[PDB]
Amino acid sequence: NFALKPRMRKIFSRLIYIAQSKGAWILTGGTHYGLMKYIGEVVRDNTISRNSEENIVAIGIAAWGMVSNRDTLIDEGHFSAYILDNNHTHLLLVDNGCHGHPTVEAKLRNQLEKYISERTSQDSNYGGKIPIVCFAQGGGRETLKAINTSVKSKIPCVVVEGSGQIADVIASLVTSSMVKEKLVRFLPRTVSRLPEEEIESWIKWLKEILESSHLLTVIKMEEAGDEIVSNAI
Amino acid sequence: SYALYKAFSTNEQDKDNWNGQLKLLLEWNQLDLASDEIFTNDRRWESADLQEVMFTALIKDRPKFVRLFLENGLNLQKFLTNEVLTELFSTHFSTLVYRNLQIAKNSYNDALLTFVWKLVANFRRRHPLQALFIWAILQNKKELSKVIWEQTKGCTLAALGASKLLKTLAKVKNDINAAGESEELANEYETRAVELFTECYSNDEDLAEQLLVYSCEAWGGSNCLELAVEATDQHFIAQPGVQNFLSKQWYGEISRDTKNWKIILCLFIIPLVGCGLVSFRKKLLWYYVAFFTSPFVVFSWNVVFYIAFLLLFAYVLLMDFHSVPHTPELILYALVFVLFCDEVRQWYMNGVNYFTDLWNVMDTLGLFYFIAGIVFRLHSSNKSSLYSGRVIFCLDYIIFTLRLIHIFTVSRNLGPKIIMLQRMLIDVFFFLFLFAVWMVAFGVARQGILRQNEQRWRWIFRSVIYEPYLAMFGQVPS
Amino acid sequence: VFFFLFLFAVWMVAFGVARQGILRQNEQRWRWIFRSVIYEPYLAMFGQVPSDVDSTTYDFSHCTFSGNESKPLCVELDEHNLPRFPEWITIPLVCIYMLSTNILLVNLLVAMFGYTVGIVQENNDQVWKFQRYFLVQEYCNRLNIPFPFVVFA
Amino acid sequence: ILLVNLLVAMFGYTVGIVQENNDQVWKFQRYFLVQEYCNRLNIPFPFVVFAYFYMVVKKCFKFRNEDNETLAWEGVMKENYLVKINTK
Amino acid sequence: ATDQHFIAQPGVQNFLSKQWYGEISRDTKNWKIILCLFIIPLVGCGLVSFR
Ligand SMILES: O=C1NC(c2cccc([N+](=O)[O-])c2)=CCN1c1ccccc1O
Numbered sequence A: 001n002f003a004l005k006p007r008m009r010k011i012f013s014r015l016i017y018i019a020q021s022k023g024a025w026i027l028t029g030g031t032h033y034g035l036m037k038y039i040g041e042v043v044r045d046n047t048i049s050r051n052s053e054e055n056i057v058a059i060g061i062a063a064w065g066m067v068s069n070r071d072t073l074i075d076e077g078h079f080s081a082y083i084l085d086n087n088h089t090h091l092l093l094v095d096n097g098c099h100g101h102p103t104v105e106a107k108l109r110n111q112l113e114k115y116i117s118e119r120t121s122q123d124s125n126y127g128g129k130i131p132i133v134c135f136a137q138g139g140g141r142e143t144l145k146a147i148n149t150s151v152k153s154k155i156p157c158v159v160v161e162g163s164g165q166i167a168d169v170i171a172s173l174v175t176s177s178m179v180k181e182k183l184v185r186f187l188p189r190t191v192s193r194l195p196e197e198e199i200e201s202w203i204k205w206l207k208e209i210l211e212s213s214h215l216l217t218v219i220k221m222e223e224a225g226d227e228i229v230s231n232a233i
Numbered sequence B: 001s002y003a004l005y006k007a008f009s010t011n012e013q014d015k016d017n018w019n020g021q022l023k024l025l026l027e028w029n030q031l032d033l034a035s036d037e038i039f040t041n042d043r044r045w046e047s048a049d050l051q052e053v054m055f056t057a058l059i060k061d062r063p064k065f066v067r068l069f070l071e072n073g074l075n076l077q078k079f080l081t082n083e084v085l086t087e088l089f090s091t092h093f094s095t096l097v098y099r100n101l102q103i104a105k106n107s108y109n110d111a112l113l114t115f116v117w118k119l120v121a122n123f124r125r126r127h128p129l130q131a132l133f134i135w136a137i138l139q140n141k142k143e144l145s146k147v148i149w150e151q152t153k154g155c156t157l158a159a160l161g162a163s164k165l166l167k168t169l170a171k172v173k174n175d176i177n178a179a180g181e182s183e184e185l186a187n188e189y190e191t192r193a194v195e196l197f198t199e200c201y202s203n204d205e206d207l208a209e210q211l212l213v214y215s216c217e218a219w220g221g222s223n224c225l226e227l228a229v230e231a232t233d234q235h236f237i238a239q240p241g242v243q244n245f246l247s248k249q250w251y252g253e254i255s256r257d258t259k260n261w262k263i264i265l266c267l268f269i270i271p272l273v274g275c276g277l278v279s280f281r282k283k284l285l286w287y288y289v290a291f292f293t294s295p296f297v298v299f300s301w302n303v304v305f306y307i308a309f310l311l312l313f314a315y316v317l318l319m320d321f322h323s324v325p326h327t328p329e330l331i332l333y334a335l336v337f338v339l340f341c342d343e344v345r346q347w348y349m350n351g352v353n354y355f356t357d358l359w360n361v362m363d364t365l366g367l368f369y370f371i372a373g374i375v376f377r378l379h380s381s382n383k384s385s386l387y388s389g390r391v392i393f394c395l396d397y398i399i400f401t402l403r404l405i406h407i408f409t410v411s412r413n414l415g416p417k418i419i420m421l422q423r424m425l426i427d428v429f430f431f432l433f434l435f436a437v438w439m440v441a442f443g444v445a446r447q448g449i450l451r452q453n454e455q456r457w458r459w460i461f462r463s464v465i466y467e468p469y470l471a472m473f474g475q476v477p478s
Numbered sequence C: 001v002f003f004f005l006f007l008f009a010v011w012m013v014a015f016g017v018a019r020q021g022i023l024r025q026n027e028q029r030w031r032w033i034f035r036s037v038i039y040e041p042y043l044a045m046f047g048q049v050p051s052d053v054d055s056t057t058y059d060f061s062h063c064t065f066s067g068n069e070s071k072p073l074c075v076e077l078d079e080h081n082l083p084r085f086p087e088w089i090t091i092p093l094v095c096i097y098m099l100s101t102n103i104l105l106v107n108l109l110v111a112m113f114g115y116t117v118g119i120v121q122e123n124n125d126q127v128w129k130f131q132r133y134f135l136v137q138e139y140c141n142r143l144n145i146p147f148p149f150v151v152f153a
Numbered sequence D: 001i002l003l004v005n006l007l008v009a010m011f012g013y014t015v016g017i018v019q020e021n022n023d024q025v026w027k028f029q030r031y032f033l034v035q036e037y038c039n040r041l042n043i044p045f046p047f048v049v050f051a052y053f054y055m056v057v058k059k060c061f062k063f064r065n066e067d068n069e070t071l072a073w074e075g076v077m078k079e080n081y082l083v084k085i086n087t088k
Numbered sequence E: 001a002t003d004q005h006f007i008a009q010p011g012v013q014n015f016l017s018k019q020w021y022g023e024i025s026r027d028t029k030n031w032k033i034i035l036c037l038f039i040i041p042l043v044g045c046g047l048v049s050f051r
């Protein structure tokens, strides 16, 4: 489930407009639920409004251990009712063992991110090198693991908002005590099910986040007019 | 409400009762509180049990809550069944609104209002959002209607139909307050339709002209342009988009940026069609058909034919009218047969509303006096019937000649003045009332003072009505 | 002016052909067609009230009975040598025409002139002093003597 | 004098009112002539009687996806117009 | 006081028109009323509204 207030509606609409003006890929989870739903809807809207001029690319990267109805072909399938989104023009589904395995696609995803961040294409203004920005707005284990896997690599360009769950706890503090103080006051209703043996691990995750504060930037509350996403990226 | 929510929340038993907290924050108008601490953490949304709170928000006029519920997820077509609509139109529908609907159906009937009377008769005893929008809009809800209108697909048709319904319900004379609010809401939605179509045209012309022509699988059984016409919404057609559509459909194949004199010059000289003088933007036989198909030149050919018809009628009536019809009378009857076939075709393809137009009334009148002139004219060897036939044809020629005014209304110059000409009849009738009063008073006073006991009715009316009438053109009674 | 002349020509043709057809029978001279269809309903715009429609002020000393001399044809006669035309159909025809042209159609032109003057006057001085350029340039362009001496130059 | 020069004044006042609405009423009336001339598929007027016989010939013998596409197109400028309303 | 704006407002105008038509409801057309005036025993029919 996903809470989308109209500010985030405007932000992600502006984001996909920037992606259409620049001719960029967008990597995401590719399931049908929530934020990927809204991204796919705006992808179909910018497709249906113009019908030409560099139709944008939305890659979904799914786990395949969570896909409900699965068909083996060479021949097109028909996936109807994790559920996949309708609107992603490209999907990639990673292979593993049993069903009960999340965080599987993160390996191939971050490996591909590293490969494009080292990929050379001199027809640009970045001195080649094909620039990469990583955005995080909500929360969860996957967000923190993605941000630290990115910032552990070079050229991540991590951008966060100022509303959400983990977006607040990275926006607000910019050691162990302050991390605990902000995390219990911004996410009180998850810590009731969290043992401390991984909470010290999460403190290590956020320490390796704030290791490099230059590769991270933030969207704020007074910065809420127009063209704020370009000013962030 | 905040005191009651702080008491209801901190019982530590009903912290899991988010349904009770939501019903409590719905019964009061607490929008910010329910958004800030029910829907924040995204820790438990089902998306299927929100129907009771939805019906409650609909019947109690809670538009920001249904906005929040649709923002966090509900499909109206999944929500709406026939039992919901019968509960709305049967129990939650007012009685004074239904009385105003009866008065409007009795005194000011219309095609759309006959349709909404049939559908309200259906639901007081398949396009879900449109019927819910009609329900919200004729209750004068004014803010639930905007929330549902943002969810519809055919939004221009929705705004135009709502403007038409509310403009009709504003004509009901009792309960003038509701008539005022329905008029204001009608003006708001017709403004909304115009301002949305000007954007849809100012981006892409071809797709806006695709929008204008569709029937929405019997929305109300009509079209966007037709609903703008039937409500006499003349600002939706006086905007440059529909004007450009109409002019591009009027010149047809010929591009609009060519001068008119080239077009009429190629009209008079036919084999000049194959030359580089007209632009067919918007091998030779296609040029031939693309010229002689367009509305402009079939209209212009038709008016040239009609001027020739009037000259033939005048020649026959003044200079060649014998006891037996010569050849140009027979050509005249052939041309009137052509006109008769056209008018009976237009009566067949219109119906009864053909007779609504005044020009079709005097058109039928002129054809009837023509065939009456024929049936008086064929009785030869009788001087009175022959003279009577010619008198009937003269009065008929008056009718046929005065129709040329309504022919030439299409011009860019003469047009707005001929339309202006019919707005003057109340000044003319005021003038004729005052002039008839003064004329009767003076005529009877003068005839009574001068003479004594006139017994002839003709010389009463020549001296009471006719000579004071001529004193309007400066005659000075003698 | 052209709107006025269009409407006035339509009413003039309709009344003239109706009156010439009701009164007379088979005029064969084109000049006395156009003097009786176009010219006399035209003079009814300056308040003339077309004359030979009354049957009590119509004398037969201004006829021809056949087109031999200048005068118009008679109104066509009965077997009693009486005029055939109905007064009850030609007196109100002249009254409707005379109302329609001499009062409605002229006092409409007055209103349209007043409206056009009411528009164009704030733009009128601008258009005049724009036109002033052309006379200033055609009089300051030539280096010239007095007009009747210009031929010398 | 009084009664005719009063009619002149009333005509002038009615012209002074209705002229800004007059072009709107004219180009609203333009719809009806455009539809009655674009409705029939017709030949030159004095030949139309021939086509009349052709219509007699008739009585002698006897969900869509791009509409969804253009409604989905309409929704985008609907959203843009609502954004503009709340932007003003 | 010749306060003609207090009477040109729609409330007193509605009061005056409701007192002018009287028993007949205002939302019936005038031609039905004058037609029932000329033909007297037509009063007993469903052509005028006595609301
Ligand atoms: O369609 C037409 N029907 C008749 C007509 C046909 C039969 C009888 C009468 N009538 O008696 O006035 C009139 C009038 C002229 N007309 C026409 C011609 C060219 C352009 C526009 C037009 O409306």
Ligand SMILES: [Ca+2]
Binding pocket: B343, B346, B359, B360, B363
């Ligand atoms: Ca007609």
